[PDB]
Design a protein around this ligand. Sequence first.
Ligand SMILES: CO[C@H]1/C=C\C=C(/C)C(=O)NC2=CC(=O)C(NCCN3CCCC3)=C(C[C@@H](C)C[C@H](OC)[C@H](O)[C@@H](C)/C=C(\C)[C@@H]1OC(N)=O)C2=O
Ligand SMILES: CO[C@H]1/C=C\C=C(/C)C(=O)NC2=CC(=O)C(NCCN3CCCC3)=C(C[C@@H](C)C[C@H](OC)[C@H](O)[C@@H](C)/C=C(\C)[C@@H]1OC(N)=O)C2=O
Lengths: 209, 214
Amino acid sequence: NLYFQGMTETFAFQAEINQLMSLIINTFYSNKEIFLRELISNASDACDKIRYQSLTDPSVLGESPRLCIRVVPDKENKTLTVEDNGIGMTKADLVNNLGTIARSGTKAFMEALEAGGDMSMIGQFGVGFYSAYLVADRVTVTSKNNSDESYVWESSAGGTFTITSMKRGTRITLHLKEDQMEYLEPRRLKELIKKHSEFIGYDIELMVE
Amino acid sequence: NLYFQGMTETFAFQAEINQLMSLIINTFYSNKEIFLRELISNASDACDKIRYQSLTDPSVLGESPRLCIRVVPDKENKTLTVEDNGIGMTKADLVNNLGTIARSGTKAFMEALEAGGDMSMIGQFGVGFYSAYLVADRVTVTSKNNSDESYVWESSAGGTFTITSTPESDMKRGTRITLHLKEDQMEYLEPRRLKELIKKHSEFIGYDIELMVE
Ligand SMILES: CO[C@H]1/C=C\C=C(/C)C(=O)NC2=CC(=O)C(NCCN3CCCC3)=C(C[C@@H](C)C[C@H](OC)[C@H](O)[C@@H](C)/C=C(\C)[C@@H]1OC(N)=O)C2=O
Ligand SMILES: CO[C@H]1/C=C\C=C(/C)C(=O)NC2=CC(=O)C(NCCN3CCCC3)=C(C[C@@H](C)C[C@H](OC)[C@H](O)[C@@H](C)/C=C(\C)[C@@H]1OC(N)=O)C2=O
């Protein structure tokens, strides 16, 4: 009907991913800061993929060819955001790869941790996105791929996530936990970005508010 | 997917129904108690329509052959409910008749009030449901018709309603109307108030009305 405004779908996580979310959100791991490197790493991969598409087909860049990553603290909303103009993600991408179908890394990473491995290796296993929950109690991912409309994924690690229906790219917004408000202070962010982005080939912009 | 647990669609009300809702949720009408009579009347109607269908096809009753209306106050959630095991409503029924396709009585009832008609006449116009908002700031309608799955309609008179659908078949044939009462309308949860109100307009109700103790 003309009067329709929106739709949200709630899905359960695949069991291993649910387990990983619980473990991460509850862990006493003492080096929580690692989340940012992972989010940035993921943006760089997103940007790489659209870049490779552009080599055969320049049109994919649209009217946004300058690829780059931006970090956005928000003291008022108590949220930190990592955004990119990379390839971005379709609904299927979000539903499949960010919830319902787990790759081999979910289990392996949990098995590595059980055998005394370190949380900082999480990226290697293809599940470092989920390190957001070390500092966050809710994560909101808004993305647009050139071949789909934009969508909003959101989860509080409560066993489920929603899918609700912007320019090409992705925004990862973290609702910070009560004790993790240090990741809104700009001096902290500057030193953290510079610590692990020596070899990221895209400019990383720290937006001031 | 295996993992799908529910959907909710948000619709805007058709203009005239939105107007009716604004007016009712804001009116300074004094005799707010008339809503109960109305919701009960509606439950009676639902019961009639299935009872009738059972004369030719008795299988429609399922495993609930006794048709009746129950009234459930809830002091904790601050709600009041009117249930029935009637014919129930499909998704289309809820969306069309309870949101997006206005019947002639919507505009007409408003025109009648404009010309000095009273809010107690609302039932003649086929819009007595919306009288719930005399005493409620939110209303949730849960319904199951034999031809569809269970749906949940909800609105707070903010210009929009929702239609939610879970795979969990908790519902059996019928409908439940749940009113989240306004702060100054907590008198409609006390048993002594409900007992006198039900009796006051349920002589010509052709079914049994059961007031539930919590
Ligand atoms: C919101 O983050 C990412 C989504 C899921 C990330 C997951 C669940 C993860 O934890 N690690 C992952 C990190 C990765 O780098 C990555 N892909 C590259 C991993 N590689 C390839 C070989 C070695 C490292 C995967 C595989 C797959 C989910 C790729 C994804 O879908 C198909 C898209 O091709 C890609 C454009 C999307 C992103 C990067 C998203 O990032 C933003 N901003 O777009 C991961 O699982
Ligand atoms: C609380 O939900 C009610 C829904 C809408 C009520 C409306 C919009 C209303 O305000 N008045 C209305 C009261 C009515 O009595 C009635 N129809 C009956 C008209 N009469 C009155 C006496 C004999 C025939 C209509 C027309 C039409 C919406 C009927 C509806 O078509 C999907 C169903 O055939 C009917 C079974 C469902 C109910 C009544 C629901 O009642 C429960 N418990 O099931 C109304 O508009």
